[PDB]
Design a protein around this nucleic acid. Sequence first.
DNA 1: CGGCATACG
DNA 2: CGTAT
DNA 3: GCCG
Length: 325
Amino acid sequence: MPAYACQRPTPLTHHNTGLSEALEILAEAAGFEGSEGRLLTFCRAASVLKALPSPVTTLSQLQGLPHFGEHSSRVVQELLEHGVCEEVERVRRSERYQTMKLFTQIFGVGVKTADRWYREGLRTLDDLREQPQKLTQQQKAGLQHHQDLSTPVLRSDVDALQQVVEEAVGQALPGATVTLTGGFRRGKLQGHDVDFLITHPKEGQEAGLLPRVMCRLQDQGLILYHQFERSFCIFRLPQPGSWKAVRVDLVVAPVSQFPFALLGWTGSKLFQRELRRFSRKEKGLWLNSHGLFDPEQKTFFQAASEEDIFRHLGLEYLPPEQRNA
DNA sequence: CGGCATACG
DNA sequence: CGTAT
DNA sequence: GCCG
Ligand SMILES: [Mn+2]
Ligand SMILES: [Mn+2]
Ligand SMILES: [Mn+2]
Ligand SMILES: [Mn+2]
Ligand SMILES: [Mn+2]
Ligand SMILES: [Mn+2]
Ligand SMILES: [Mn+2]
Ligand code: NA
């Protein structure tokens, strides 16, 4: 079992769902308390279990697995023996965890804002609605649309959105292309939002594209909210006899950077963090969604494909469906 | 012990 | 500060 | 919280 998640296939569905979900509760709770290191360890331990070929049934099966020490092993031990982990259940039931989860799941509210509101005594969405003068426009939109945005987006919804985005992109710049990324590209059947990557085969023609796309979407009446190369929108998605608000992310990259942007925006989040960590710490190369930089030669790697990037890093290629770390 | 990914709006 | 994978 |  390799130590980095980018060194191992991780499928979307696996054989240790309950164990990984418990560890991810502790990771989330660590994040609400600002402990990014503990969050990462719990996330990595969770992902190791997702990568195993069969269920963990006995504690000895953890011996030698990376990222399982005293704490994560005890969590698993309790789940194996009693079906529940007291720490995990204590977190689940806590007022702090529930409220931080509720607040941070609002579009426009991060851990720092949620925590401040929590310390001020606020607990519910109606508590936030009562004093809208304290809210940003982004948070007002997140709060107004919160119910719709908590409803899973279905792959059937995605095809519809892709069609309307392509229509606007085709008018903004003939020849430009739209690629579905994010969790749906990794094979998820449901998601919290839809992620699209836009480019054009002639380097430089994509310059200025996103404002032109946004203006055309807004003119078709499809944009309930938007704030460049990244656009975090709320779309109006037609529904049977009505519609619902859906979060959509639109990203533009020049074709030279497209493989890096595709790789980054396809995720998972943990997979990309681990991949960038591996790149820097094991290979001495600096990776982001624009490129891969050798700081010794002071040069950027040219990539024509995700396969190129994996090869550059000395990693076996992983299709998106196996990047579900 | 230090590090923990790395961007853009 | 928020957002993204 | 865990690794190197
Ligand atoms: Mn502990
Ligand atoms: Mn016991
Ligand atoms: Mn997404
Ligand atoms: Mn997104
Ligand atoms: Mn850029
Ligand atoms: Mn330390
Ligand atoms: Mn996400
Ligand atoms: Na949020």
